Symmetry: C2
């Protein structure tokens, strides 16, 4: 497939120069005020979306459990036990069917949002990740999917929902924020707001949006996304603490996922959250979690390849039956595990099913209760669960989560991977309690460290994940035990496989730029990765040549150049070549006054022109006759160019009958005179640093004599291409 990258690099021409000349300091102040207002509105809307999801998820799950529990009781009295299972299966099948249909409406809504958000912040523009229909389909699918008990999450897709809101909202409201730079900034702000609403950590969201889109440090935009995040996480709170509780002005609880309070349960001699002796246990748990994450990634990748090979090339009826099958299998498994193998233990959140008086079923309590309740019980309750219960729950949940993720329904991954780790940590703590005394430390710390290790194994994130976990825990003293677990579980896992998101984005074939290049990559030069073949546009060019090159070629940008070695066309080109050059003596005076050879020809680089501007010029009557001088021109303004910005007409779409051939079109005013260039003798690391951090596109390579020698595109800087070229370079010598 082929994808269109974002045009993040700024383009400055005469219309923009006129707008800048008209611009004044008061206008700049008004612009900044409007930008602040838009940021605040984005935060508020993301908070409202989170509230809308959470309220209906809770309502549906509570109603479903209310219908079944009584039926469980009556059908257990006589011993039928069937109607309880039949009603549960009916509810699950209905919800999963609705979610599958909704995903069938919009294909990109499937799976977690993060794989399709790391690409937009990197500038790949997956074809359907901004459209409002995607937002509606995903937000409706998430509530239906989790209500069906598919072992999924809600905190995942909230990032994509916030990203869509941030991308869309400013467009609805000197055109305002038409350039792709502003769109990318607002997408970053929306992603940060979504992360804050999901996890309750504002600084974690700011740091997540800082990376995954790594550009030059923009002090003044980070200060805006932090405000957006703070507003987003304190609007969800203001309503979720006013609906659940009675007080309205109170801010009693952070966003969707909260771990609780980490303190010694009772005033006890020598009770601490953690001590220096536990560090070995933390390291061992980290490496175990890394191995488990590697196994999870391996099985998930194999399953994804199998589905991509067989299931996808099937009619629309298939890919809908698979979700129903997995929902049925998981419902049957959870019901059987609640009925049998669940140890009844002597005693509102706790559910007692199939169990005698004054006793509760731990398996049922873990499986039925919503994931937040299960997490809270695993962290802050001691002695409630037997080790066999924990082992069975961990194995079943791990296998079912590994099998489930990837199917059509809008799954999540943070919670179902945050739940197995807690169970493993609690099991480890229970084992350690028997052999040695554990009174000197808290019990829930092991569960927290296990959860952190499993996340580190599965997703393999850094910096952002550490901050998110620390600010969710609400205890800064957990800074060290968590981090030394994230940096170990990662290092253990990188031996076997990459992260889930990297695996699922490499399957799509999307080209992604890595963070840094190896030293062997630096050994290469820039002359080895450029593309010697070029498509060029002369200034004052023929309209027939323009339409021919636009129809024949697929490149999105053309270097406007002049030959180095119609009569009016040639005369105008020579006049421009003499007018454009500026010598140092001239500048000082101004200050004081106050075959293959034909194919590969020397050309002097003058600028870059985008395909969109050429199409816009062709659509309008932008041309002059050969007899007439180039002075006469429509001279379109900025607003006229931006009028067609959201949707750019295709060249084949245009009728093109009106256009008169043998007509000269001037592209000098509308081109980008000064793009970032680089000498062919430069090394790969500098080129990669520029092309990544500056976020630009189509980096031209020009030699010492001003001859343009090549163009570098993102396809030339992927890891596979660099590795292949390095292997070829070793093969040459």
């Amino acid at each position: 497939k082929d994808y269109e990258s974002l045009d993040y690099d700024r383009c400055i021409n005469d219309p923009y120069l006129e707008v800048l000349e008209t611009m004044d300091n008061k206008k700049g102040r008004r612009y900044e005020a409007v930008k602040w207002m838009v940021v605040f509105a984005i935060g508020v809307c993301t908070g409202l979306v989170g509230l809308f999801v959470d309220f209906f998820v809770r309502l549906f799950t509570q109603l479903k459990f209310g219908v079944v529990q009584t039926s469980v009781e009556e059908c257990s009295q006589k011993g039928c036990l069937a109607l309880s299972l039949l009603e549960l299966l009916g509810f699950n099948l209905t919800f999963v069917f609705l979610a599958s249909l909704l995903v069938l409406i919009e294909p990109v809504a499937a799976g977690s949002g993060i794989p399709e958000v790391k690409c937009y912040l990197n500038g790949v523009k997956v074809p359907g990740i901004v459209r409002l229909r995607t937002l509606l389909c995903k937000v409706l699918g998430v509530l239906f999917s989790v209500a069906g008990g598919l072992f999924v999450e809600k905190e995942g897709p909230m990032i994509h929902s916030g990203s869509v809101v941030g991308a869309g909202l400013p467009q609805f409201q000197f055109p305002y924020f038409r350039s792709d730079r502003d769109k990318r900034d607002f997408v970053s702000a929306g992603a940060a707001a979504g992360v804050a609403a999901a996890f309750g950590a504002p600084i974690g969201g700011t740091l997540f949006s800082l990376e995954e889109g790594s550009s030059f440090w923009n002090q003044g935009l980070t200060w805006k996304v932090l405000f957006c995040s703070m507003s987003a996480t304190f609007t969800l709170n203001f309503f979720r603490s006013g609906i659940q509780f009675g007080s309205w002005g109170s801010f009693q609880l952070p966003g969707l996922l909260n771990f609780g309070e980490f303190k010694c349960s009772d005033s006890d001699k020598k009770c601490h959250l953690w001590t220096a002796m536990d560090l070995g246990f933390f390291v061992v748990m980290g490496v175990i979690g890394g191995l488990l994450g590697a196994t999870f990634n391996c099985l998930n990748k194999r399953l994804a390849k199998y589905r991509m090979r067989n299931v996808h090339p099937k009619p629309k009826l298939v890919r809908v039956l698979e979700s129903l099958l997995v929902s049925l299998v998981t419902t049957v498994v959870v019901f059987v595990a609640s009925m049998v193998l669940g140890e009844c233990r002597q005693m509102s959140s706790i559910k007692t099913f199939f169990c005698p008086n004054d006793t509760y079923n731990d398996m049922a309590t873990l499986f039925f209760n919503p994931q937040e309740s299960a997490i809270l019980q695993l962290f802050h309750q001691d002695g409630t669960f037997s080790p066999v219960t924990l082992a069975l729950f961990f194995v079943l949940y791990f296998l079912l989560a590994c099998w489930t993720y990837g199917i059509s329904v809008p799954s999540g991954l943070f919670v179902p991977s945050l739940l197995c780790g807690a169970a493993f940590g609690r099991l480890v703590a229970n084992v350690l309690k028997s052999y040695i005394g554990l009174g000197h430390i808290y019990s829930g710390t092991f569960a927290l460290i296990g959860a952190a290790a499993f996340l580190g194994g599965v997703v393999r994130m850094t910096i952002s994940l550490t901050v998110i976990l620390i600010e969710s825990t609400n205890e800064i003293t957990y800074g060290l035990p968590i981090m030394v677990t994230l940096m170990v579980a990662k290092w253990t896992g990188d031996f076997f496989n990459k992260g889930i998101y990297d695996i699922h984005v490499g399957l799509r074939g999307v080209p992604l730029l890595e963070w840094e290049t190896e030293v062997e990559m630096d050994k290469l030069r820039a002359s080895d990765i450029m593309e010697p073949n070029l498509t060029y546009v002369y200034p004052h060019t023929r309209i027939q040549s323009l339409v021919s090159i636009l129809r024949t070629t697929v490149h999105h940008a053309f270097p406007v150049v002049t030959e180095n070695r119609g009569n009016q066309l040639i005369s105008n080109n020579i006049k421009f070549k003499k007018s454009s050059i500026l010598t140092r003596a001239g500048e000082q005076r101004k200050r004081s006054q106050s075959t293959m050879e034909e194919r590969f020809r020397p050309l002097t680089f003058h600028g870059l022109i985008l395909r969109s501007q050429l199409v816009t010029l062709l659509v309008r009557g932008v041309c002059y006759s050969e007899s007439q001088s180039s002075a006469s021109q429509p001279r379109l303004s900025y607003a006229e160019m931006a009028e067609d910005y959201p949707r750019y007409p295709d060249i084949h779409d245009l009728d093109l009958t009106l256009l008169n051939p043998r007509m000269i079109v001037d592209v000098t005013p509308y081109m980008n005179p000064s793009p970032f260039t680089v000498s062919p003798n430069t090394h790969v690391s500098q080129v990669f640093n520029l092309f990544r951090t500056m976020g630009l596109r189509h980096l031209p390579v020009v030699n010492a004599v001003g001859e343009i020698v090549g163009i570098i595109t993102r396809h030339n800087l992927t890891y596979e291409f660099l590795q292949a070229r390095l292997r070829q370079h070793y093969q040459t010598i």
Copy 2:
């Protein structure tokens, strides 16, 4: 004055190419392991430095108070009251005299460290901010100064101490970390570790080190400075909780400054930390704090100008008497205010002086106790202080702190400005309690918001300050009230004056690059700010010309160029000019095979050469005779060049008698062939973005025909120069 900037931009030549060719993947892994070890060692050493400061500060202050309190009692019994004052004055004078002498040893140790650290991370290299003597003098001065009761802090200079440790330590231990890039990275890590040790907030330190040195996002170095910060803040804890308390494995308290625990004092109906109705109070307190900060900055700037005009041009005897005078004045004032105007209130930390039975003096309790104890009492004690006490303490402390800062002794600023705000907030809370019921909210919140507002007014920091305050508070729910106070007190203050650090760095005359440029600055072009005059070096140049240009000129870099329009010299230059050019046809074939006019002359740009490399070449026997070809050359290796890295000999220092004139020196191998260049038609914003974020130096401007037209240096991008050039541009038209 003139200052030498850091050479952050990487230089790649043939010795480095040889080292890279010898380099292997295993060697890279070993390099990364060594770098991690160095980072951890830096963190540990910074923690140890913090512990060393804190322990002796506590010991000295406790001993001084132990000597005086008994003498206070006996001399009060008869009514003399003199010996108590005499002993206090003697102690204060001795400590302040020692601190003043120690600062007299090293001039740069004076004042807070931050003004001299913002310059190094920006690349200015203040002449004495890395030397170990500065570290020793500052660390010894801080403990003596605060023990004298000069109304100063300890958290300020810890940043400079960590920076010095990070700069120095790797040098003590393929040369390792010789390039200035590694030195700057380690300085950033040391600054982050120092901030973490001072305030107990690791992420705050990471974010402080991220800004103030804004460069391209380096994922893989942030992940190292975060580890350094975490290790630094958890080594100070491990010892300060094992010395003060009894348990050794326990981590009971964060770094030097801790705010405590923010919870409702008793289980009470409708008790919350804060509610939505308080936001107006927070905004009003923020604007009041902004006005107060503006006043503080105004008076401090006027006093600093007065001292710079009169006090500084004086012999060394002066500038030592001023510190003694201020110490005497503050001791007399504090003793008198403790004796009189301190209201005795009915009842170990609390001090009862000059007061009858079962009563304590609030003035004495606030003034005598260490600043941490005063802060803790102001935050978490209600009803202890009368409003008159608070007003008098605030006024006196504000005036004395404004007068004190700037003198020789190593003062701090965070604590003395964090203490007035707390008093103001407590006074506001006490006033509000009388008029309206305040039972619905906590009392200390007003003190915290007042402190945050006063810091925002005085220092005017963002992002970093917010995170530092949030992670010191240990309550994420304070995210919004703090931040909406920082962003208001800043906006209120920016009307009148800049921050303290900006004022004190603008007085030194140091050129600093601002974060962003205005749109009017973008209206300017690059041709208007470049310097048309150049000093150039031909390849294969005469040694006499080299020595003449090195002695005559002061520029630190020379563009190696060739004329565009000895016989052996000219022949070699022409041969190099033909050998260097690479045409696109040639590259494709290679792949397939597999007066004033004399003064201002057209020159083709070939590279950049630093003065240091030229001096190194001159020191060694790097030359060849005219008859001999250029093939023969000593061909120095990387280690030989780096051997002289720490100290570069001056040209005037060299005897130069051995050097034989009329001898050709080849500089082609040792130059930087591919520096970042920019076209003269580019706009100012792009140039500023490159020259800032890439951290480079001496950005060359070359036109379309390859002619070099100018050089841009940091002196051309300061705010004053840009404003002057913009005014001139308006004047022209």
